[PDB]
Amino acid sequence: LQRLHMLQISYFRDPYHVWYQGNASLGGHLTHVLEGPDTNTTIIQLQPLQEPESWARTQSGLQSYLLQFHGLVRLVHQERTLAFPLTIRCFLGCELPPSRAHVFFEVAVNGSSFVSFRPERALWQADTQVTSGVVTFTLQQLNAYNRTRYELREFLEDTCVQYVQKHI
Ligand SMILES: *[C@@H]1O[C@H](CO)[C@@H](O[C@@H]2O[C@H](CO)[C@@H](O)[C@H](O)[C@H]2NC(C)=O)[C@H](O)[C@H]1NC(C)=O
Ligand SMILES: *[C@@H]1O[C@H](CO[C@@H]2O[C@@H](C)[C@@H](O)[C@@H](O)[C@@H]2O)[C@@H](O)[C@H](O)[C@H]1NC(C)=O
């Protein structure tokens, strides 16, 4: 298939300080690397697939995503008390056959599947059998707002797909 996969590992020492490590692969080729603390994260395209204006917008959007991602983790901790240190893994992307696209967004915590995005209804589901205040609250937050439902679905089904179509 024609695919863009994105992987984000987030190392939280505490609610306020996170180290990001991640990357993206297009057609099985490493294309982007993400690394560093939340206050000065480095994001590069390894090959200049996007021109500067397009790349600047993409970088701005990624940074906005990280701000939202970190804000959500802080909120869950604030309301339900997370155990630190912890690592979060987000694995997401889109896959185009040789019109329709398969998209996915899976979240794991400390290496165990936690929640994932079901794009059919733009809803997050529990990926664990373990019941907890944390999973219920996180799902409630993720499912309460357009930004984490339909806006994320647009990113996967439109932004990601058009990126694969333009650059593969
Ligand atoms: C994620 O895993 C880390 C260990 O890698 C957990 O941290 C441990 O938490 C227990 C209980 O609070 C402490 O006794 C240990 O000292 C901690 N380890 C370290 C290295 O500090 C953390 O609680 C886990 N977080 C989850 C499961 O959400
Ligand atoms: C990212 O930032 C790291 C931390 O910055 C340091 O701490 C802050 C609080 C300020 O005192 C600042 O002046 C310090 O430099 C750096 O250690 C690291 O090198 C930075 N990464 C890059 C790529 O610049």
mmCIF file of C-alpha atoms and ligand atoms in Angstrom:
data_model
loop_
_atom_site.group_PDB
_atom_site.id
_atom_site.type_symbol
_atom_site.label_atom_id
_atom_site.label_comp_id
_atom_site.label_asym_id
_atom_site.label_seq_id
_atom_site.Cartn_x
_atom_site.Cartn_y
_atom_site.Cartn_z
ATOM 1 C CA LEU A 1 0.000 0.000 0.000
ATOM 2 C CA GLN A 2 0.733 3.745 -0.080
ATOM 3 C CA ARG A 3 1.080 4.706 3.563
ATOM 4 C CA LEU A 4 2.114 7.442 5.951
ATOM 5 C CA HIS A 5 2.817 6.171 9.471
ATOM 6 C CA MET A 6 3.556 8.520 12.371
ATOM 7 C CA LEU A 7 4.911 7.419 15.711
ATOM 8 C CA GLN A 8 5.194 9.573 18.835
ATOM 9 C CA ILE A 9 6.748 8.362 22.085
ATOM 10 C CA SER A 10 6.175 10.788 24.963
ATOM 11 C CA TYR A 11 8.262 10.357 28.152
ATOM 12 C CA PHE A 12 6.643 12.114 31.116
ATOM 13 C CA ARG A 13 8.845 12.487 34.178
ATOM 14 C CA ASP A 14 6.023 14.532 35.722
ATOM 15 C CA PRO A 15 2.901 16.318 34.430
ATOM 16 C CA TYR A 16 4.751 19.421 33.303
ATOM 17 C CA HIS A 17 7.857 18.075 31.559
ATOM 18 C CA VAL A 18 7.837 15.691 28.600
ATOM 19 C CA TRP A 19 10.488 14.469 26.186
ATOM 20 C CA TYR A 20 9.213 13.653 22.704
ATOM 21 C CA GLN A 21 10.732 11.046 20.435
ATOM 22 C CA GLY A 22 9.026 10.167 17.200
ATOM 23 C CA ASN A 23 9.253 9.765 13.466
ATOM 24 C CA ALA A 24 7.244 9.312 10.316
ATOM 25 C CA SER A 25 7.667 6.957 7.404
ATOM 26 C CA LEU A 26 6.199 7.368 3.957
ATOM 27 C CA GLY A 27 6.177 4.302 1.734
ATOM 28 C CA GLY A 28 8.378 2.514 4.253
ATOM 29 C CA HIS A 29 11.046 5.246 4.141
ATOM 30 C CA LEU A 30 11.913 7.302 7.206
ATOM 31 C CA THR A 31 10.883 10.888 6.360
ATOM 32 C CA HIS A 32 10.567 12.905 9.580
ATOM 33 C CA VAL A 33 12.106 12.890 13.027
ATOM 34 C CA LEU A 34 10.695 14.466 16.180
ATOM 35 C CA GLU A 35 12.897 14.798 19.284
ATOM 36 C CA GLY A 36 13.252 16.862 22.441
ATOM 37 C CA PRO A 37 11.624 18.482 25.482
ATOM 38 C CA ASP A 38 8.167 19.998 25.177
ATOM 39 C CA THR A 39 9.603 23.494 25.483
ATOM 40 C CA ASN A 40 11.972 23.208 22.475
ATOM 41 C CA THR A 41 10.993 20.174 20.414
ATOM 42 C CA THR A 42 12.908 19.557 17.193
ATOM 43 C CA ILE A 43 10.920 18.598 14.112
ATOM 44 C CA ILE A 44 12.586 18.006 10.751
ATOM 45 C CA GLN A 45 11.701 16.589 7.363
ATOM 46 C CA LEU A 46 14.744 14.523 6.345
ATOM 47 C CA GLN A 47 14.124 15.250 2.642
ATOM 48 C CA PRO A 48 12.591 18.578 1.555
ATOM 49 C CA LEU A 49 9.250 17.117 0.526
ATOM 50 C CA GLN A 50 7.418 20.308 1.504
ATOM 51 C CA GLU A 51 8.401 23.786 0.336
ATOM 52 C CA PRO A 52 9.116 26.329 3.123
ATOM 53 C CA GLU A 53 5.611 27.842 3.383
ATOM 54 C CA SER A 54 3.958 24.434 3.395
ATOM 55 C CA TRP A 55 6.566 23.060 5.787
ATOM 56 C CA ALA A 56 6.111 26.007 8.169
ATOM 57 C CA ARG A 57 2.372 25.411 8.343
ATOM 58 C CA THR A 58 2.912 21.689 8.942
ATOM 59 C CA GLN A 59 5.474 22.393 11.683
ATOM 60 C CA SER A 60 3.068 24.871 13.300
ATOM 61 C CA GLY A 61 0.293 22.301 13.232
ATOM 62 C CA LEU A 62 2.472 19.601 14.739
ATOM 63 C CA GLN A 63 3.519 21.986 17.523
ATOM 64 C CA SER A 64 -0.153 22.822 18.114
ATOM 65 C CA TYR A 65 -0.917 19.114 18.279
ATOM 66 C CA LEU A 66 1.792 18.599 20.899
ATOM 67 C CA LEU A 67 0.473 21.499 22.963
ATOM 68 C CA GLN A 68 -2.999 19.934 22.903
ATOM 69 C CA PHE A 69 -1.641 16.457 23.607
ATOM 70 C CA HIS A 70 0.334 17.694 26.616
ATOM 71 C CA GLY A 71 -2.613 19.776 27.836
ATOM 72 C CA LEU A 72 -4.811 16.666 27.792
ATOM 73 C CA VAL A 73 -2.306 14.614 29.798
ATOM 74 C CA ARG A 74 -2.043 17.418 32.322
ATOM 75 C CA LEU A 75 -5.850 17.602 32.570
ATOM 76 C CA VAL A 76 -6.236 13.840 33.117
ATOM 77 C CA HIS A 77 -3.594 13.963 35.846
ATOM 78 C CA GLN A 78 -5.205 17.035 37.378
ATOM 79 C CA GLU A 79 -8.627 15.385 37.563
ATOM 80 C CA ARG A 80 -7.779 11.681 38.036
ATOM 81 C CA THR A 81 -4.118 11.423 39.254
ATOM 82 C CA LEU A 82 -1.663 9.731 36.843
ATOM 83 C CA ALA A 83 1.339 7.682 38.081
ATOM 84 C CA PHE A 84 4.687 9.078 36.960
ATOM 85 C CA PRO A 85 7.030 8.516 35.213
ATOM 86 C CA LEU A 86 5.025 7.207 32.307
ATOM 87 C CA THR A 87 5.406 6.833 28.567
ATOM 88 C CA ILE A 88 2.658 7.354 26.030
ATOM 89 C CA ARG A 89 2.873 6.000 22.505
ATOM 90 C CA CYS A 90 0.732 7.386 19.685
ATOM 91 C CA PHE A 91 0.766 5.405 16.438
ATOM 92 C CA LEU A 92 -1.349 6.877 13.685
ATOM 93 C CA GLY A 93 -1.570 7.273 9.959
ATOM 94 C CA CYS A 94 -3.335 6.584 6.704
ATOM 95 C CA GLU A 95 -3.055 3.862 4.061
ATOM 96 C CA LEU A 96 -4.235 4.115 0.429
ATOM 97 C CA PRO A 97 -4.842 0.998 -1.711
ATOM 98 C CA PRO A 98 -3.745 0.886 -5.387
ATOM 99 C CA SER A 99 -10.094 6.280 -3.509
ATOM 100 C CA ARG A 100 -10.739 4.839 -0.036
ATOM 101 C CA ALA A 101 -8.332 5.285 2.841
ATOM 102 C CA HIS A 102 -7.716 3.316 5.984
ATOM 103 C CA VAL A 103 -6.816 5.563 8.929
ATOM 104 C CA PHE A 104 -5.891 4.733 12.510
ATOM 105 C CA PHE A 105 -4.748 6.314 15.776
ATOM 106 C CA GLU A 106 -3.711 4.028 18.626
ATOM 107 C CA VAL A 107 -2.620 5.179 22.066
ATOM 108 C CA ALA A 108 -0.651 3.041 24.517
ATOM 109 C CA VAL A 109 0.499 3.868 28.047
ATOM 110 C CA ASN A 110 3.633 2.278 29.515
ATOM 111 C CA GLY A 111 3.596 -0.154 26.597
ATOM 112 C CA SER A 112 -0.014 -1.385 27.026
ATOM 113 C CA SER A 113 -2.855 -0.530 24.651
ATOM 114 C CA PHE A 114 -4.968 2.209 26.200
ATOM 115 C CA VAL A 115 -7.409 3.865 23.760
ATOM 116 C CA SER A 116 -7.812 4.059 20.008
ATOM 117 C CA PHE A 117 -9.756 6.108 17.475
ATOM 118 C CA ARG A 118 -12.595 4.518 15.508
ATOM 119 C CA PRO A 119 -12.917 6.784 12.457
ATOM 120 C CA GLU A 120 -16.297 5.389 11.291
ATOM 121 C CA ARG A 121 -18.099 7.499 13.913
ATOM 122 C CA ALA A 122 -15.076 9.638 14.928
ATOM 123 C CA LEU A 123 -15.169 8.121 18.416
ATOM 124 C CA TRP A 124 -12.491 6.923 20.821
ATOM 125 C CA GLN A 125 -12.809 3.466 22.350
ATOM 126 C CA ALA A 126 -11.130 1.720 25.243
ATOM 127 C CA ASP A 127 -8.353 -0.613 24.154
ATOM 128 C CA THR A 128 -7.809 -2.031 27.642
ATOM 129 C CA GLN A 129 -9.837 -4.445 29.722
ATOM 130 C CA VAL A 130 -8.619 -2.648 32.859
ATOM 131 C CA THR A 131 -11.296 -0.342 34.215
ATOM 132 C CA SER A 132 -10.056 2.862 35.760
ATOM 133 C CA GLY A 133 -11.011 6.414 36.445
ATOM 134 C CA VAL A 134 -8.237 7.387 34.053
ATOM 135 C CA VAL A 135 -9.535 5.547 30.991
ATOM 136 C CA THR A 136 -13.160 6.572 31.519
ATOM 137 C CA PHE A 137 -12.196 10.224 32.034
ATOM 138 C CA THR A 138 -9.807 10.282 29.076
ATOM 139 C CA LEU A 139 -12.444 8.793 26.762
ATOM 140 C CA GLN A 140 -15.030 11.286 28.059
ATOM 141 C CA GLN A 141 -12.676 14.188 27.243
ATOM 142 C CA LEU A 142 -11.610 12.790 23.865
ATOM 143 C CA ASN A 143 -15.247 12.180 22.865
ATOM 144 C CA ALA A 144 -16.628 15.494 24.163
ATOM 145 C CA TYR A 145 -15.006 17.844 21.625
ATOM 146 C CA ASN A 146 -14.969 18.309 17.854
ATOM 147 C CA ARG A 147 -11.209 18.864 18.013
ATOM 148 C CA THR A 148 -10.524 15.270 19.056
ATOM 149 C CA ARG A 149 -13.278 13.731 16.957
ATOM 150 C CA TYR A 150 -14.143 15.246 13.594
ATOM 151 C CA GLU A 151 -11.100 17.511 13.348
ATOM 152 C CA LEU A 152 -8.762 14.591 13.994
ATOM 153 C CA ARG A 153 -10.722 12.507 11.494
ATOM 154 C CA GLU A 154 -10.195 15.249 8.907
ATOM 155 C CA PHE A 155 -6.475 15.194 9.616
ATOM 156 C CA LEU A 156 -6.306 11.436 9.058
ATOM 157 C CA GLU A 157 -8.693 11.207 6.119
ATOM 158 C CA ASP A 158 -7.781 14.455 4.331
ATOM 159 C CA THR A 159 -4.451 15.952 5.446
ATOM 160 C CA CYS A 160 -2.590 12.632 5.788
ATOM 161 C CA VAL A 161 -4.117 11.170 2.619
ATOM 162 C CA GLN A 162 -3.320 14.241 0.522
ATOM 163 C CA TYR A 163 0.229 14.151 1.884
ATOM 164 C CA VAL A 164 0.643 10.527 0.731
ATOM 165 C CA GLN A 165 -0.923 11.390 -2.628
ATOM 166 C CA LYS A 166 1.366 14.394 -3.107
ATOM 167 C CA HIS A 167 4.672 12.944 -1.877
ATOM 168 C CA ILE A 168 4.780 9.163 -2.322
HETATM 169 C C1 LIG B 1 4.730 3.453 34.214
HETATM 170 O O1 LIG B 1 5.874 2.693 34.543
HETATM 171 C C2 LIG B 1 6.711 3.263 35.554
HETATM 172 C C3 LIG B 1 7.909 2.354 35.661
HETATM 173 O O2 LIG B 1 8.561 2.276 34.401
HETATM 174 C C4 LIG B 1 5.930 3.383 36.855
HETATM 175 O O3 LIG B 1 6.754 4.042 37.809
HETATM 176 C C5 LIG B 1 6.829 3.271 39.018
HETATM 177 O O4 LIG B 1 5.694 3.467 39.852
HETATM 178 C C6 LIG B 1 5.741 2.698 41.063
HETATM 179 C C7 LIG B 1 4.429 2.936 41.770
HETATM 180 O O5 LIG B 1 4.166 4.328 41.877
HETATM 181 C C8 LIG B 1 6.949 3.120 41.896
HETATM 182 O O6 LIG B 1 7.026 2.300 43.058
HETATM 183 C C9 LIG B 1 8.230 3.006 41.076
HETATM 184 O O7 LIG B 1 9.320 3.566 41.801
HETATM 185 C C10 LIG B 1 8.083 3.739 39.744
HETATM 186 N N1 LIG B 1 9.258 3.543 38.911
HETATM 187 C C11 LIG B 1 10.133 4.518 38.641
HETATM 188 C C12 LIG B 1 11.281 4.143 37.753
HETATM 189 O O8 LIG B 1 10.009 5.649 39.103
HETATM 190 C C13 LIG B 1 4.660 4.191 36.624
HETATM 191 O O9 LIG B 1 3.869 4.178 37.805
HETATM 192 C C14 LIG B 1 3.848 3.626 35.456
HETATM 193 N N2 LIG B 1 2.727 4.497 35.148
HETATM 194 C C15 LIG B 1 1.515 4.045 34.801
HETATM 195 C C16 LIG B 1 1.341 2.554 34.784
HETATM 196 O O10 LIG B 1 0.593 4.809 34.527
HETATM 197 C C1 LIG B 2 16.255 22.241 24.649
HETATM 198 O O1 LIG B 2 16.245 22.856 25.872
HETATM 199 C C2 LIG B 2 17.071 22.228 26.854
HETATM 200 C C3 LIG B 2 16.788 22.952 28.149
HETATM 201 O O2 LIG B 2 17.067 24.341 28.021
HETATM 202 C C4 LIG B 2 17.795 24.769 29.184
HETATM 203 O O3 LIG B 2 16.876 24.952 30.263
HETATM 204 C C5 LIG B 2 16.000 26.115 30.184
HETATM 205 C C6 LIG B 2 15.121 26.084 31.435
HETATM 206 C C7 LIG B 2 16.831 27.401 30.053
HETATM 207 O O4 LIG B 2 17.691 27.588 31.225
HETATM 208 C C8 LIG B 2 17.700 27.338 28.791
HETATM 209 O O5 LIG B 2 18.480 28.536 28.799
HETATM 210 C C9 LIG B 2 18.617 26.074 28.839
HETATM 211 O O6 LIG B 2 19.425 25.937 27.654
HETATM 212 C C10 LIG B 2 18.531 22.318 26.411
HETATM 213 O O7 LIG B 2 19.352 21.656 27.362
HETATM 214 C C11 LIG B 2 18.679 21.674 25.038
HETATM 215 O O8 LIG B 2 19.999 21.876 24.536
HETATM 216 C C12 LIG B 2 17.663 22.277 24.067
HETATM 217 N N1 LIG B 2 17.691 21.604 22.783
HETATM 218 C C13 LIG B 2 18.034 22.252 21.671
HETATM 219 C C14 LIG B 2 18.001 21.446 20.393
HETATM 220 O O9 LIG B 2 18.395 23.433 21.702
#
